[PDB]
């Protein structure tokens, strides 16, 4: 049950690319801006 | 009711921000509005 | 209470650098990777 990281006033969610770069996107669906969340414990 | 959270990082003590044109950085203002977040289930 | 942000399409962590820069890495050993997730109020 992955979450999403959106931007409150942009509406962007973070996306992070294969090639390790990190950017925003308004897609919803692209499956690089699913992240898991833990504890670094 | 929202809840916004911020992003930050424990080494630099920045927080995370994605600006407008869809770039992504780091930054001590603690009251720039687009360290904002909004975290929810991807379902 | 740090906690990682691991995009699940390409087991990336997110990583704020040294300097600045926004990045993802598979380097579980870096402590860039950690992050504290608290409310803006």
Redo the contacts between chains.
Sequence with gaps: ??????????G?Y?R???D??????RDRSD??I????????
């Design positions: 049950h992955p979450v999403l990281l959106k931007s409150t006033e942009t962007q973070l992070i690319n294969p390790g770069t990190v950017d925003g996107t499956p690089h699913q992240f898991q969340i833990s504890p670094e414990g």
